[PDB]
Amino acid sequence: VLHLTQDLFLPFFSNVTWFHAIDNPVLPFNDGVYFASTEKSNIIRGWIFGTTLDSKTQSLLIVNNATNVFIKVCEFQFCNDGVYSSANNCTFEYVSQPFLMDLEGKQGNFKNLREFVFKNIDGYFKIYSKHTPDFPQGFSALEPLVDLPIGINITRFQTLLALNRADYYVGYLQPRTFLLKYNENGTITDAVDCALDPLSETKCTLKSFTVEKGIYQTSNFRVQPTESIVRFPNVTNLCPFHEVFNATRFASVYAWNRTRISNCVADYSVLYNFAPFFAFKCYGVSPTKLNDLCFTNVYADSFVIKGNEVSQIAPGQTGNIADYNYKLPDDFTGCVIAW
Amino acid sequence: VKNKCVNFNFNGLTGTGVLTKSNKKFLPFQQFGRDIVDTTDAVRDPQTLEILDITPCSFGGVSVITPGTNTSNQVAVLYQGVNCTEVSVAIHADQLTPTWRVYSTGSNVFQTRAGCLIGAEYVNNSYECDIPIGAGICASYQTQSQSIIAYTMSLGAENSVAYSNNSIAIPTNFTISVTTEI
Amino acid sequence: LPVSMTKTSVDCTMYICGDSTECSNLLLQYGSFCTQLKRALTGIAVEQDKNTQEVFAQVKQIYKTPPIKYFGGFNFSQILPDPSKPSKRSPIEDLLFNKVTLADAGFIKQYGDCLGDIAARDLICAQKFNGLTVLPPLLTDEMIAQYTSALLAGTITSGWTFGAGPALQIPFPMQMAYRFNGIGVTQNVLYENQKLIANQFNSAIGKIQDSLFSTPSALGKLQDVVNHNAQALNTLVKQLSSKFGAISSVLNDILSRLDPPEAEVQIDRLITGRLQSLQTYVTQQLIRAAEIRASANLAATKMSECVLGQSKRVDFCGKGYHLMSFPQSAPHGVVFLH
Amino acid sequence: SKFGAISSVLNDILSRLDPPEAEVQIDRLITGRLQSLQTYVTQQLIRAAEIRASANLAATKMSECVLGQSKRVDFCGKGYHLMSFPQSAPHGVVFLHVTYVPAQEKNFTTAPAICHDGKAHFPREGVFVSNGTHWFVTQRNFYEPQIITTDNTFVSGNCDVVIGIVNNTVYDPLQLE
Amino acid sequence: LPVSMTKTSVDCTMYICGDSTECSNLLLQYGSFCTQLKRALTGIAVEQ
Ligand SMILES: *[C@@H]1O[C@H](CO)[C@@H](O[C@@H]2O[C@H](CO)[C@@H](O)[C@H](O)[C@@H]2O)[C@H](O)[C@H]1NC(C)=O
Ligand SMILES: *[C@@H]1O[C@H](CO)[C@@H](O[C@@H]2O[C@H](CO)[C@@H](O)[C@H](O)[C@@H]2O)[C@H](O)[C@H]1NC(C)=O
Ligand SMILES: *[C@@H]1O[C@H](CO)[C@@H](O[C@@H]2O[C@H](CO)[C@@H](O)[C@H](O)[C@@H]2O)[C@H](O)[C@H]1NC(C)=O
Ligand SMILES: *[C@@H]1O[C@H](CO)[C@@H](O[C@@H]2O[C@H](CO)[C@@H](O)[C@H](O)[C@@H]2O)[C@H](O)[C@H]1NC(C)=O
Ligand SMILES: *[C@@H]1O[C@H](CO)[C@@H](O[C@@H]2O[C@H](CO)[C@@H](O)[C@H](O)[C@@H]2O)[C@H](O)[C@H]1NC(C)=O
Ligand SMILES: *[C@@H]1O[C@H](CO)[C@@H](O)[C@H](O)[C@H]1NC(C)=O
Ligand SMILES: *[C@@H]1O[C@H](CO)[C@@H](O)[C@H](O)[C@H]1NC(C)=O
Ligand SMILES: *[C@@H]1O[C@H](CO)[C@@H](O)[C@H](O)[C@H]1NC(C)=O
Ligand SMILES: *[C@@H]1O[C@H](CO)[C@@H](O)[C@H](O)[C@H]1NC(C)=O
Ligand SMILES: *[C@@H]1O[C@H](CO)[C@@H](O)[C@H](O)[C@H]1NC(C)=O
Ligand SMILES: *[C@@H]1O[C@H](CO)[C@@H](O)[C@H](O)[C@H]1NC(C)=O
Ligand SMILES: *[C@@H]1O[C@H](CO)[C@@H](O)[C@H](O)[C@H]1NC(C)=O
Ligand SMILES: *[C@@H]1O[C@H](CO)[C@@H](O)[C@H](O)[C@H]1NC(C)=O
Ligand SMILES: *[C@@H]1O[C@H](CO)[C@@H](O)[C@H](O)[C@H]1NC(C)=O
Ligand SMILES: *[C@@H]1O[C@H](CO)[C@@H](O)[C@H](O)[C@H]1NC(C)=O
Ligand SMILES: *[C@@H]1O[C@H](CO)[C@@H](O)[C@H](O)[C@H]1NC(C)=O
């Protein structure tokens, strides 16, 4: 079969960042990391994942050793080099067979190449590997080992080292359509991308590794917009907010003066710059998300009271000013002003 | 901003189109402009009170022309129904949807009536059509040492009858031929 | 006789979900449903090209008329190519080409003047805005005239021999003598009334152009073909403004108004309606293609039998006893002069 | 395909939802499968019609080319038709049209008629051919030069109306004997 | 040999929504899904 799938895959003939060793940059993670390394026996011990690399967000530990693994997702504080110093609120402990397979035919010339690919789509930390005993051209698929639902945040990826007394072919995966040819016994002998070269999509469109002579309508091209303008009508017609907030004979509380507000555009910067203010307790409307709301009618009542009566004015209260002069309904939605 | 594919959101009318100057006769009470098939055509700018058209950004199709993969691996790309000057500039600014990029060596640019072909060269000879491209143009894989050319198809071998007012030709032999129909 | 129809390559996602990632994603769930429509349209296009090939490319060699035009007094100027005209077409070809108007030429590259349309953008620009395109014919309207000229200049200088094997020359009076002999009346009558037959031939050729010029519509068949195709395209475009039983008829404002997890139903109803409309368009196009294919097969047979030889089956190549026929090219068709 | 439903396996959606809501989901899959079946059957009808047209053409070709020889041009192969043989193929038929094609030709000369003594003589079948020096009679599709005899030339005319007429003598086997 | 067939003239409004204004209004939202059918039937009749 020639199954064509759509999943996070490392782009073909894309560049991969080949490092050396002898200080271990913390490479990013986005939509997967392809890994590769060729070595004599062993120089890589463990991996750590996540964001901020500290004891505040969750990170990952999959460190190997001579015989087993140490799969865990915890909140390790720091190592700077005995790989952790914090395991207070940490769980998800798992143990299995070691990931590293090394075989030699009585000689070290069999430098097995270790390609690794992982992902965290909808969490579920998938782990794969394959060892094949510059960069080989012959294809090699990858076999899964462990599939665990972590469900945490991943942004950066790190690799640990080993001790001693050429590797790091690091790539990234993206959402890509791939076409894979499967053997009759179930191995993968080849793969071809679908968004790299015209011939590649020419093969993917007919899903055939051999294309006869001809001309094939493959896809559709479209000039994506250069920029994005948004344009809305003109604005004007402000309210008498200056005329209601700068009067001279604000009436007493026993007869609270009411001003009706209509037919305007609502400038709300004046509600901010006017006076250093003393109380801005809004109840039903967010004090910053108020310019994005549309109202039919608005009332403004202005009067003078003492200091304690200012804090007394609130939904569901008591006292001589909230029970004999002015009452505010419990389901009131708006903002109060006091300076 | 004008003369560029730009995402507009005119007074709630979301869409993508090339905007430019127009010579409509929008009456004082008019805002929109439509067609017989009811598509928003010209929009009077609310803060410019001018007339500005809307046009498809660059709707087309891509066809890849190639000989058999067992013979060679090279390909050429044709963009359906668009002067490649626009696609050329669009490639140069990197805003085409296809991410695959075919080479532009200058010798591979041909403005057909079916679009414009990129990746093949124009020889002016005439041969039997092999790969039908469109509008009287054919392409083929031919040894130079091998590449893909563009040419105009030949309708057939050029011949002229020798008509005269008192001359006839009469066959002195024959042949028998066996064809086949399926 | 019509021979071919305009060739179209509608594309699903651009038609059905204007540059909307979520709408394309939900369209993807229906499987390879619209893939059939594409393959079907490609088959239609290839069939059109094949129809033109079979009808016109009946001769492998392009013959040319002799420099002089005196075939025993017979007048063929009205049908042979006219050098003065830049398109190199006979006057009968010119009347036919001037009496037929095409809604969508296709070989115009109209992109670039839709922004410059000044007035309301026309049918072509309106269609192109919703992912609907028209491809150009493989054989231009010019080399079809060259094929017709070769066929015409082979008939009048070699008889019917060029249709069987090598072309052998023979004077036109002797060719007409044998054509007379084929209908049961001896060559004597032609060799006696050569002048009368020449004069009648001329008069008929003269009056056919008047009959074509003065009539309101004698080219109704090709015009109906063009009108039907254009009307189908217009009724396909007009369906994108139909509400189909949802909140709105436009994806761009349906997505900008409602969130994914509740606008899913609205996008689904729009998908169903638009998919069914595209299905209907494709099916009608398939049926019309079958009809045009039958007509093109008949035209190819008529050319092969009436032009490269004279037919004995009655009322096939015109009313009466058949003598000759001459082909003329027309937009998306052919015209015979029996 | 899910067709806008929860899953594309009828049994799978059953064990995870209540019957009424499951029924709602169930309809979506049925409608999609139905529309699929409608598409399949309609395209099959189109294909069957085109195959029937081809089969009718094959029957006519068999009857006319195989059970006789036809005068229709370019029908049973290119050239002058002689025979045809049928062969069987999977889901079809194959014909073997045997035709007669002329060969090497020579410009000779010609004459509409020949005026021996005041009368125009015409070839019953064939053309009048002059080698360049002597006049003869022959067929059209093959060159068999034959002496000019009245047995091949009927007489009707007056030697004054034939444009391009030429001159020679005609022969008769009757005056000799 | 058959030469022709009967000429039917179905009408979508009454077929789908038997004299009901609400159903007529609801059917009005599905576009021009009726004029095409009427045109096809008329063409078939003229062809016969
Ligand atoms: C799939 O697996 C089969 C069994 O292992 C392979 O067949 C084998 O072939 C080997 C020689 O290659 C024999 O020695 C053995 O007896 C058995 O028949 C088969 O080849 C394999 N498929 C492949 C490799 O593509
Ligand atoms: C007519 O044309 C025939 C070919 O179609 C000629 O037959 C050839 O004869 C030669 C020997 O003369 C063979 O060697 C050759 O294979 C072929 O059969 C035939 O001679 C020719 N006749 C005349 C009179 O021109
Ligand atoms: C053969 O038919 C031609 C058709 O174009 C005749 O040409 C005509 O030329 C005259 C002037 O010479 C024009 O006034 C007329 O409109 C037409 O083009 C041509 O004379 C005619 N001649 C013979 C010998 O029949
Ligand atoms: C005229 O046609 C004659 C055909 O019969 C040719 O004459 C031949 O000449 C030879 C000797 O020259 C005779 O022996 C033979 O019987 C035959 O008559 C002759 O070639 C031809 N002339 C021309 C000019 O074509
Ligand atoms: C064939 O021979 C005829 C006589 O046998 C010719 O007729 C002659 O015509 C001339 C004038 O052309 C008269 O003066 C003479 O009396 C006789 O009628 C005839 O022309 C000739 N034809 C050709 C084509 O040479
Ligand atoms: C990888 O990076 C190099 C720059 O070092 C760049 O030239 C190359 O194009 C990149 N790879 C791809 C596939 O673009
Ligand atoms: C290796 O890791 C496993 C993981 O549980 C641990 O039990 C073991 O002690 C470690 N050391 C060796 C030598 O296996
Ligand atoms: C684990 O997190 C909880 C969160 O409320 C906190 O109360 C507790 O102290 C944490 N455990 C530690 C820090 O060991
Ligand atoms: C993961 O981290 C990035 C940046 O640190 C942040 O934007 C995002 O919301 C985080 N995701 C979750 C699920 O916390
Ligand atoms: C009220 O208005 C007067 C002038 O009209 C101005 O001087 C004064 O500053 C205003 N009051 C406040 C609090 O700004
Ligand atoms: C507010 O005070 C002004 C002036 O004293 C008066 O005209 C108006 O009626 C008052 N509005 C009230 C009490 O609602
Ligand atoms: C929009 O308002 C601004 C500010 O009043 C003004 O300068 C501009 O001319 C207005 N535009 C139109 C088209 O009214
Ligand atoms: C597209 O074609 C050419 C090539 O640049 C140019 O004249 C113009 O941009 C367009 N022409 C038309 C007729 O639209
Ligand atoms: C040769 O080809 C060029 C295009 O490469 C064309 O412009 C020119 O007319 C051709 N000349 C001949 C004689 O065919
Ligand atoms: C044949 O004769 C006519 C009449 O004299 C003449 O006009 C014509 O040119 C001749 N044909 C040729 C090929 O010379
Ligand atoms: C007759 O002679 C002409 C002289 O140009 C020649 O072109 C033609 O081929 C000849 N006819 C034949 C050989 O049948």
Residue numbers in the entry:
A (entry chain A): 47 to 68, 80 to 138, 158 to 209, 215 to 246, 263 to 436
B (entry chain A): 534 to 677, 689 to 726
C (entry chain C): 727 to 1064
D (entry chain A): 968 to 1144
E (entry chain B): 727 to 774
Question: What do the authors of the reporting publication say about this deposited model?
Answer:
To further structurally verify this, we determined the cryo-EM structure of the BA.2.86 S-trimer in complex with hACE2. Consistent with binding results, both the N354 glycan and T356 are located far away from the interface. Surface plasmon resonance (SPR) results demonstrated that RBDs with or without the N354 glycosylation showed comparable binding affinities to hACE2, indicating that the N354 glycosylation does not impact hACE2 binding. Moreover, the binding affinities of the BA.2.86 S-trimers with or without the N354 glycosylation for hACE2 yielded similar results, despite N354 glycosylation promoting the S-trimer ‘RBD-down’ state. However, we noted that variants with the N354 glycosylation exhibited very high affinities to hACE2, reflecting that tight binding might be required to further recover the compromised infectivity.
The dense glycan shield consisting of 22–23 N-glycosylation sequons per protomer is an essential feature of SARS-CoV-2 S architecture. The glycans have been shown to play intrinsic and extrinsic roles in protein folding, modulating conformational activation and immune evasion. The transition to the ‘up’ state exposures of RBD for the binding to hACE2 is also a prerequisite for S-mediated viral fusion, directly correlating with infectivity. Here, we dissected the role of N354-linked glycosylation, acquired by BA.2.86 sub-lineages, as a RBD conformational control element in attenuating viral infectivity.
